[PDB]
Design a protein around this nucleic acid. Structure first.
Lengths: 137, 383, 140, 250, 42
RNA sequence: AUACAGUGAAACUGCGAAUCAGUUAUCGUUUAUUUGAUAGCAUGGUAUAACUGUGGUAAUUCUAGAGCUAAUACAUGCUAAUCUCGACCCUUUGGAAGAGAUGUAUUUAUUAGAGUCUUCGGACUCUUUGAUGAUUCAUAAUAACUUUUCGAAUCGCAUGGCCUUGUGCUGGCGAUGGUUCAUUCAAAUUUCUGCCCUAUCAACUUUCGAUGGUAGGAUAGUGGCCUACCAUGGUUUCAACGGG
């Protein structure tokens, strides 16, 4: 796709030279916001836009990198992961079944599968409630 | 006298001591006297006077010079106080241009509402001179780059009229008609540099048409001749010499820009006068441009080599020998590539030209290039 | 939040606004002129705003023609015309060239008048031109 | 606007009234810098109370590292010198065995320079390079071989640099913080992670290594040549039991 | 009122501006000397 | 001390007026103050305070009237001048005719910001920039927009020098101000855990925002903090939701 909205989607200020000839018309902007990853081929030769993504959008990653299992993908560009971590209680002195909800903005770099494990880090706050961003599934 | 001027501006009984009114308007005094006298002339009526035409003429000259704000506003009030028929549709433009909120697009738009009447031309030229009188440090720059670019929305006759208006105070054709100029005034010499800056600004704003006015071009030549006159009339206390070096560099770079920008329907058949002035500029030291940033000397020589018409006034003097000498210096700078391109352009535009003088210049150029283009060791750009 | 601004076209009049921590912001209202820029070879000029044709979120602004960010324009073409025929010696892209004798150009606003108080246009050229002519076709 | 939760290396008792001196804004952080009031009143006892501390500051008398700075709560902290013309003294004030601020007594030719770990380096404006060290000495024009976590020798009379010091294996380092505070030595190995928790590791006579985060430590110098005379005879703080054992031996 | 002191202070402001510039743009050159030394080194 | 010179009431100006707990990031914000760097007209006008007076009013720290006069209060406003290439000389460590170059604040568009040869000593050319883990980072150039920002109309102590004794030109110490950057001190948000009892609380949130994505507005900014447009989500027997 190229549009889903009345407005236009475009990488801001990374434009081509609109006089001379190049076979891209927009230099798709490379970035990596850290964490030692190699840049993805979908970002080098991709087609989406995603201003909340950490590979073309202008948001940065650092801080709290955590993991979990994907259970919910039904929203728009944001998936909910399951940090299924066991807790401890001073009453029982045993272990118990616990998990919390963590939503994370999915990126269309690689596909959005229901069930995989992701490695997501703390970003500048993309929305009202979601705080992290997908850097790698 | 300041109390007398204030009392005569308070008690408004005009046409009772109006005997020396136009003589005082054509005479000189201080600025504290000039502000009160322009306030009195705006408080009067000027319909029937000793000479109402002379009063309007002094008002136009005051709104021209004006020191860019105050007498501009006072003379605009005087011009509205005169017979201002067909100007109530431009009184908003006059008040805006005299005011310090002179949005230049707004002034040229309110005049474009007052257009098809042509009764705003003298006021617009005086407003252009007021906006051109801005002086020094980046506010003057932000105003001048606005003014010289925004005055391009005007008539094709009125642009040459404003150029002649700049030409008027420092034309000096009666001074330079006999041999050259002999009187040196630094205050008028600075106005020559102001005319040079305004002409370069107008050329850079509109470098296709450029609007040639012949007396303005000859006055620019007279300013460059006054620069060479001061250089031969060295004033070695040398504030005047520094001013003359500031005038001649910008003057040569401006005179090269007009020819090299228009280059098709300008530079009329009287090119021998400009060739004589360039011969006077080269007779000091023809090879004084051996640097790579050789400004306007190599540009005029290369433009005369490029445009095939100018070879006649080129070969009038021996100037191709001068360009070949500056090219054939031993340790010549990176302008040697422009000199070789000049040889390429002057081979098929002088050796394919009229045989009497242009082929003679081409023969001299080929004789220079046979025994003077030996060290071809340009180890830089392979292009 | 604070009050809306909804700045209009014609008769420049700007509120003086001091905000949180210095940062003097220019709440411009009723913008009259605009600085626009050739996006492929870089020349900018102050240029007189005519109207706003497109709004990318609400056709209430296509009705009332309110100046904001990201609203496609048709503005003046005359100072770009004077430079285009006064320094070239040509006096003339092809679909940009088609917008010459129509008396209107096409561009977009990025600077917020309720925040910065400026007025910026970039002359759209290429796939921007293609998408925005398709947006003109989407309206019409 | 108040205090008494002061950093306990200030030798501050509890029954000295309630409030402690709040360090005003200056070169250093509050947690690792002592003010001139807690210096001149209850660190070397040249004064008695704040009134006469104000007297001996506005007597044009004190000169923290080249200049007067009449301010009681002035945070002249680590690696500075405090010269006084009367009492002949120069105090480079550094860390020590236990963690508090040891005074020195420094002569003039060692008192006419300090040194500084660089905190960051950039290019300031108009093409000019840009160096800032730990005390806010934003200094233009270094030598171009600039690293970060790196020691520059500040001339301290005119505020330029007089000498440059790199950092690698086999040249001294001195810790400012952590549990191992005020300790020297640099000879094990130069390990680096990413994301911190790395140190230039620390020697001992028994090869005892102390590894902290690299923001705390910085170079003094090299073997045989440190640029500061060191407190209490090069204090490495072996042991109280080893001290009593050496007491029983000799 | 124009005093002997006021134009003295104006003169001192002139001297301070010209002295700051005539130290700054020379310290630029003494930095460029070390940069040229390292450029001949590398 | 015939401008002023000591103290100096009054007044203006300047400055200052569920605690949640541990807990990371601010490459998402501003950063007053301190501290360190940092910017080539013998000096003009308001519009007034205290005060002098006229009163009202039971009265208030109530006041109106007119006469006054101050600025570091308000509002305008300025001086060629230096760095490159320097052919030639006369030897230079120069001085030179002149071919030249010229700040800052806001906004947008960019663009850059990636194996021989030997005087065995020496040379013979090799690559442009500051980094973090990471950038549209730091920084430099053009184009104009600026309801046009700043680039000192300020003060105290001495007041020394150059000699062409002008009444010249210079010159010290430091008080305030002021552009930008950094520091320091802060704020305002943000990542991870927790506390009162409950299934005689099992469903809770898209009521008139619920939860996302795209644009716009608000923002000091990341950000439904809101607007429209696209999607119909999200939470939960894990003790959620509600109540004590």
């Amino acid at each position: 796709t190229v549009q889903s909205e009345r407005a236009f989607q475009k990488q801001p200020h990374i434009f081509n030279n609109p006089k001379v000839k190049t076979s891209k018309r927009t230099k798709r902007w490379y970035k990596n916001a850290g964490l030692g990853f190699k840049t993805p081929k979908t970002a080098i030769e991709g087609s989406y836009i995603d201003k909340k993504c950490p590979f073309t959008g202008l948001v940065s990653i650092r801080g709290k990198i955590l993991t979990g299992t994907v259970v919910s993908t039904k929203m728009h560009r944001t998936i909910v992961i399951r940090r299924a971590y066991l807790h401890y209680i001073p009453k029982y002195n045993r272990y118990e079944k616990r998990h919390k909800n963590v939503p994370v903005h999915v990126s269309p770099a690689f596909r959005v599968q229901v069930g995989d494990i992701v490695t997501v880090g703390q970003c500048r706050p993309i929305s009202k409630t979601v705080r992290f961003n997908v850097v790698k599934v | 006298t300041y109390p007398i001027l204030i009392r005569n501006q308070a008690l408004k009984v005009m046409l009772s001591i109006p005997q020396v009114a136009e003589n005082h308007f054509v005479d000189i005094a201080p600025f504290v006297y000039n502000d009160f006298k322009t306030y009195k002339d705006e408080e009067d009526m000027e319909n029937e006077r000793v000479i109402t035409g002379s009063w309007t003429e002094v008002d136009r000259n005051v709104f021209l010079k004006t020191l860019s704000k105050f007498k501009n506003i006072k003379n605009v009030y005087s011009a509205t106080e005169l017979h201002d028929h067909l100007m109530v549709l431009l009184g908003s433009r006059n008040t805006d241009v005299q005011k310090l909120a002179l949005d230049a697009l707004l002034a040229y738009k309110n005049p474009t509402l007052n257009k098809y009447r042509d009764n705003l031309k003298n006021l617009l030229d005086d407003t252009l001179f007021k906006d051109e009188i801005t002086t020094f440090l980046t506010e003057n720059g932000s105003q001048s780059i606005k003014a010289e670019d925004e005055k391009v929305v005007m008539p094709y006759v009125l642009r040459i009229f404003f150029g002649r208006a700049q030409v008027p105070p420092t034309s000096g054709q009666k001074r330079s008609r006999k041999i050259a100029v002999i009187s040196v005034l630094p205050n008028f010499k600075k106005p020559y540099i102001n005319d040079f800056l305004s002409l370069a600004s107008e050329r850079l704003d509109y470098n296709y048409f450029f609007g040639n006015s012949h007396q303005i071009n000859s006055s620019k030549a007279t300013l460059k001749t006054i620069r060479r006159m001061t250089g031969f009339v060295n004033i070695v206390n040398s504030t005047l010499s520094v001013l003359r070096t500031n005038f001649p560099l910008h003057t040569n770079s401006v005179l090269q820009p007009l020819i090299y920008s228009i280059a098709m329907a300008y530079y009329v058949l009287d090119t021998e006068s400009t060739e004589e002035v360039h011969l006077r500029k080269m007779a000091s030291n023809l090879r004084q441009q051996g640097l790579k940033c050789l400004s306007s000397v190599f540009e005029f020589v290369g433009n005369t080599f490029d445009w095939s018409t100018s070879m006649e006034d080129i070969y009038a003097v021996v100037v191709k020998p001068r360009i070949s000498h500056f090219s054939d210096e031993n340790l010549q700078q990176p302008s040697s590539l422009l000199r070789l391109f000049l040889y390429w352009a002057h081979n098929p535009s002088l050796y394919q030209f009229l045989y009497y003088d242009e082929f003679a210049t081409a023969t001299a150029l080929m004789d220079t290039i046979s025994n003077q283009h030996v060290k071809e060791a340009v180890i830089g750009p392979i292009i | 939040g604070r009050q809306p601004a909804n700045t209009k076209i014609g008769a420049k009049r700007i509120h003086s606004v001091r905000t949180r921590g210095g940062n003097k912001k220019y709440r411009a209202l009723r913008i009259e002129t605009g600085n626009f820029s050739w996006a492929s070879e870089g020349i900018s000029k102050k240029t007189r705003i005519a109207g706003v044709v497109y709004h990318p979120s609400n056709n209430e602004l296509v009705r009332t023609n309110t100046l904001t960010k990201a609203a496609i324009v048709q503005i003046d073409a005359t100072p770009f015309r004077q430079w285009f025929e006064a320094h070239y010696g040509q006096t003339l892209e092809s679909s940009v060239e088609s917008q010459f004798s129509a008396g209107r150009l096409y561009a977009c606003i990025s600077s917020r008048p309720g925040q910065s108080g400026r007025c910026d246009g970039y002359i759209l050229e290429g796939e921007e031109l293609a998408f925005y002519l398709r947006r003109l076709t989407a309206k019409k | 606007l108040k205090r008494l939760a002061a950093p306990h290396h200030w030798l501050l008792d509890k029954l000295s009234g309630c409030y402690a001196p709040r360090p005003s804004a200056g070169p250093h952080k509050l947690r690792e810098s002592l003010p001139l009031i807690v210096f001149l009143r209850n660190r070397l006892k040249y004064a008695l109370n704040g009134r006469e501390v104000k007297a001996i500051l506005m007597q044009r008398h004190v000169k923290v590292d080249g200049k007067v700075r009449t301010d009681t709560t002035y945070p002249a902290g680590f690696m500075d010198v405090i010269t006084l013309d009367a009492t002949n003294e120069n105090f480079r004030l550094v860390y020590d065995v236990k963690g508090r601020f040891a005074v020195h007594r420094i002569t003039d030719e060692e008192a006419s320079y300090k040194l500084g770990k660089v905190k960051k380096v950039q290019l300031g404006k108009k093409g000019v390079p840009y160096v800032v060290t730990h005390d806010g000495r934003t200094i233009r024009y270094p030598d171009p071989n600039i690293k970060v976590n790196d020691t520059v020798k500040i001339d301290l009379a005119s505020g330029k640099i007089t000498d440059f010091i790199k950092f690698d294996a086999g040249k001294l380092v001195y810790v400012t913080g952590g549990r191992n505070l005020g300790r020297i030595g640099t000879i094990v190995h130069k390990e680096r992670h990413d994301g911190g928790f790395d140190l230039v590791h620390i020697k001992d006579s028994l090869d005892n290594t102390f590894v902290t985060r690299l923001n705390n430590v910085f170079v003094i110098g090299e073997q045989g040549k440190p640029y500061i005379s060191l407190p209490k005879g090069k204090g490495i703080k072996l042991s109280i039991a080893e001290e009593r054992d050496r007491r029983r031996a000799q | 009122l124009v005093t002997p002191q006021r134009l003295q202070r104006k003169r001192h402001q002139r001297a301070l501006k010209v002295r700051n510039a005539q130290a700054q743009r020379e310290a630029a050159a003494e930095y460029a000397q070390l940069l040229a030394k390292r450029l001949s080194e590398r």
